[PDB]
Amino acid sequence: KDELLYLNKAVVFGSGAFGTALAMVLSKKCREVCVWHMNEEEVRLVNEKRENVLFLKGVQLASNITFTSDVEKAYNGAEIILFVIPTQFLRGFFEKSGGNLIAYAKEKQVPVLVCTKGIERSTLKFPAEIIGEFLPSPLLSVLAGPSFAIEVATGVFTCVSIASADINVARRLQRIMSTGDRSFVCWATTDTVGCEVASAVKNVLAIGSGVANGLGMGLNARAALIMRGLLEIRDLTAALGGDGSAVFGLAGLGDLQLTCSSELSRNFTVGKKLGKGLPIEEIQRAVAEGVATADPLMRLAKQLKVKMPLCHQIYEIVYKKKNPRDALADLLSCGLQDEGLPPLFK
Amino acid sequence: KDELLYLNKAVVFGSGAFGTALAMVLSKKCREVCVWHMNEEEVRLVNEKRENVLFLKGVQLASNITFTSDVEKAYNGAEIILFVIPTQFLRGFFEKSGGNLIAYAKEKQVPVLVCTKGIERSTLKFPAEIIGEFLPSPLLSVLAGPSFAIEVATGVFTCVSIASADINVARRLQRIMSTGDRSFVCWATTDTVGCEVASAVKNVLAIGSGVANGLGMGLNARAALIMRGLLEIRDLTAALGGDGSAVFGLAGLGDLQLTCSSELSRNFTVGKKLGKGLPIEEIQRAVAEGVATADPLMRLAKQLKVKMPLCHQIYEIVYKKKNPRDALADLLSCGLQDEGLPPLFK
Numbered sequence: 001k002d003e004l005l006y007l008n009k010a011v012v013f014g015s016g017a018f019g020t021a022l023a024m025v026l027s028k029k030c031r032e033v034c035v036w037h038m039n040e041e042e043v044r045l046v047n048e049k050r051e052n053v054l055f056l057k058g059v060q061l062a063s064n065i066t067f068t069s070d071v072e073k074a075y076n077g078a079e080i081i082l083f084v085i086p087t088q089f090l091r092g093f094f095e096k097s098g099g100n101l102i103a104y105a106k107e108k109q110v111p112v113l114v115c116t117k118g119i120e121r122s123t124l125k126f127p128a129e130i131i132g133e134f135l136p137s138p139l140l141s142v143l144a145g146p147s148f149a150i151e152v153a154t155g156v157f158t159c160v161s162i163a164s165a166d167i168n169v170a171r172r173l174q175r176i177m178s179t180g181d182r183s184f185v186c187w188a189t190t191d192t193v194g195c196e197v198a199s200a201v202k203n204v205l206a207i208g209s210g211v212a213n214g215l216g217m218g219l220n221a222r223a224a225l226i227m228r229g230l231l232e233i234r235d236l237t238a239a240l241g242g243d244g245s246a247v248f249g250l251a252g253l254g255d256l257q258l259t260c261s262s263e264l265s266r267n268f269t270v271g272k273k274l275g276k277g278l279p280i281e282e283i284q285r286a287v288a289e290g291v292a293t294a295d296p297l298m299r300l301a302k303q304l305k306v307k308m309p310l311c312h313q314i315y316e317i318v319y320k321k322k323n324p325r326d327a328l329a330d331l332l333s334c335g336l337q338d339e340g341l342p343p344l345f346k
Numbered sequence: 347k348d349e350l351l352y353l354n355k356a357v358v359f360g361s362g363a364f365g366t367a368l369a370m371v372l373s374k375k376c377r378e379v380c381v382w383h384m385n386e387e388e389v390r391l392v393n394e395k396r397e398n399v400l401f402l403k404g405v406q407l408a409s410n411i412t413f414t415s416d417v418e419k420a421y422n423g424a425e426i427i428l429f430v431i432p433t434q435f436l437r438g439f440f441e442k443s444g445g446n447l448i449a450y451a452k453e454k455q456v457p458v459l460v461c462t463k464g465i466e467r468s469t470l471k472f473p474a475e476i477i478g479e480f481l482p483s484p485l486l487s488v489l490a491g492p493s494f495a496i497e498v499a500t501g502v503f504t505c506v507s508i509a510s511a512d513i514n515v516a517r518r519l520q521r522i523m524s525t526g527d528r529s530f531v532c533w534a535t536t537d538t539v540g541c542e543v544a545s546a547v548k549n550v551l552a553i554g555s556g557v558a559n560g561l562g563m564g565l566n567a568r569a570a571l572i573m574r575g576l577l578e579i580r581d582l583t584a585a586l587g588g589d590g591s592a593v594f595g596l597a598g599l600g601d602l603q604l605t606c607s608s609e610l611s612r613n614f615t616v617g618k619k620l621g622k623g624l625p626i627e628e629i630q631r632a633v634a635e636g637v638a639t640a641d642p643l644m645r646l647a648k649q650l651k652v653k654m655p656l657c658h659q660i661y662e663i664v665y666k667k668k669n670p671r672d673a674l675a676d677l678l679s680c681g682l683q684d685e686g687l688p689p690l691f692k
């Protein structure tokens with residue numbers, strides 16, 4: 001259906017640049033929107049300054065956005081729930097504070113939208129999969145696509161995709177997240193897995209992009225990194241059970257191309273230093289997503305016997321003091337190959 | 347085979363930034379390399395200055411590169427032929443000067459490499475297809491991929507793909523074009539058509555990229571343009587008979603992502619002005635590829651009944667004084683949709 005849905009309330013768990021930006025979209029589709037941040041003092045500050053001076057500096061919170069540190073106040077009444085809490089704290093949030101939240105969600109069949117990205121080290125599971133150990137899969141959807149937070153927060157044209165096992169769940173979320181001025185447009189897909197794989201691997205690939213640049217390479221190089229890197233997202237996706245339809249779409253190619261040209265992103269800058277030769281120890285001074293993700297990503301790949309050439313060489317560069325140039329050459333040690341893509345049309 | 351081939355001679359027909367840059371690659375794989383430019387006086391100049399001051403300013407021609415205006419001197423001995431002559435003059439070159447060249451190519455089974463890009467207005471045929479009316483298809487290959495000329499000319503890491511009906515022809519060209527230092531790496535594919543479609547349509551899409559920017563949009567937008575734009579390349583490719591395997595590869599996604607972020611490209615700048623509202627008449631002051639290509643591209647699409655939403659709206663903006671904002675809204679008039687990509691894995 002091409003007709004939008006407006007609600008009375010929405011809560012967002014995660015007070016980062018991304019969740020905050022997402023609350024601005026919701027603020028235009030929901031009467032009320034709470035954003036859950038844990039530090040009570042910060043909650044008040046932000047509410048006073050009418051601005052998340054914490055993670056999205058320079059943006060003016062809609063007046064109907066209210067930060068709260070009380071989980072219970074956050075979800076009560078909410079007709080949509082967004083999770084954007086970082087991977088590492090996800091499970092612990094659910095164990096230590098999700099009790100009432102879970103029961104509420106189950107009782108009222110409240111749609112849940114996963115926006116957290118990564119791989120959990122202990123289990124090597126993805127964010128929606130974790131959340132799925134606490135909440136029935138049918139209530140769950142995943143949001144992914146090229147979406148720089150500032151741009152999303154200030155209403156500049158953005159297209160993301162929403163994925164759910166049941167397309168019909170995605171289509172209903174598509175109608176709650178899409179704005180009235182067509183500035184935030186959601187496309188439906190069923191590929192939850194491809195979405196989550198693309199989201200996680202893009203951050204690792206994005207350090208490679210930095211590596212390339214620090215190494216003296218240019219735009220031809222980066223384009224080739226995005227293209228080959230995508231095959232790695234596609235193969236890991238196949239192995240994990242996904243149907244792969246998100247791979248060449250917004251969640252995959254779209255978010256991947258974006259994240260890799262983000263020259264001022266911390267993923268890029270870190271790779272760029274490693275590229276220039278600076279040791280990782282010297283660098284770290286606010287961790288980069290790709291750095292944290294490379295390790296688990298590598299363990300998961302190994303466990304599933306998926307070859308991910310770019311992601312391994314990026315992992316070695318980051319974790320095992322491998323010379324970027326030695327890495328590049330090894331990557332190119334393969335010899336002359338076929339492009340390796342299947343025909344679309346027989 | 348992962349082992350390279352070096353030759354005694356190579357000729358390149360086309361004295362642009364691209365062919366000139368390609369001659370620098372060849373100059374490292376061929377004893378001798380002639381580059382055919384028509385103006386005899388210019389030929390001498392360039393040869394004296396040891397630099398194509400004409401279209402690739404600031405680059406030092408290998409010493410084994412010699413410009414010549416004598417077709418006959420150009421190909422005699424050549425063991426590979428590259429065409430990079432612009433589309434519009436392609437046929438006329440073959441009719442007015444290819445006589446001896448054609449016979450020579452046929453007689454010695456000289457591999458031909460098509461690097462020209464576009465759609466010929468009269469026939470709506472692509473460059474390799476044209477050349478195929480004068481030369482047996484088996485001798486023909488197509489080169490495509492993300493490859494900014496300066497970067498290719500100065501040896502900065504570049505990956506392109508080479509396509510031929512027979513993969514084995516592509517693999518042999520792959521071994522002649524790939525350099526000894528792995529700075530120019532060629533991947534083989536059979537998708538000649540997808541390659542040529544991607545090459546032509548990317549220039550039109552690249553004006554859209556400019557439109558987006560002139561309209562105030564940012565990087566999220568551009569990423570979404572690249573992703574949806576690609577479907578248009580895929581659908582036109584299906585209709586023309588291609589197997590589509592080049593689409594999500596170097597020739598497609600790769601070259602597309604590159605060409606659309608080329609903020610200083612004439613395709614971008616033109617779109618950007620149209621975006622800012624400047625009338626096309628006011629703009630033109632050296633035509634942009636996408637401008638010339640939009641018309642034929644639109645006629646070809648129509649003739650084949652392929653819907654190419656972005657390319658049509660770009661055509662209207664360029665040829666029919668359509669307001670970019672009116673265009674954007676119409677493009678978004680579709681309503682809430684599914685992403686529309688097939689599963690890769692069943």
Ligand SMILES: CCCCCCCCCCCCCCCC(=O)O
Pocket residue numbers: 208209211212217221222224225228309310313314315317324327328331332334505
């Ligand atoms: C950690 C290594 C990153 C180095 C950055 C490389 C710059 C872009 C390289 C892209 C070339 C792709 C190589 C693919 C080779 C293969 O498939 O085995």
Ligand SMILES: CCCCCCCCCCCCCCCC(=O)O
Pocket residue numbers: 159554555557558563567568570571574655656659660661663670673674677678680
């Ligand atoms: C000539 C029009 C160009 C306007 C530039 C638009 C900026 C990026 C827009 C990408 C959104 C893709 C819209 C697809 C809608 C559809 O499939 O019908």
Ligand SMILES: Oc1nc(Br)nc2nc[nH]c12
Pocket residue numbers: 038085089090092093
């Ligand atoms: O322990 C923690 N839980 C959550 Br939820 N978020 C955090 N941020 C820092 N420490 C944290």
Ligand SMILES: Oc1nc(Br)nc2nc[nH]c12
Pocket residue numbers: 384431435436438439
């Ligand atoms: O007529 C022409 N033929 C070729 Br080949 N190239 C050209 N460039 C300008 N006019 C030309």
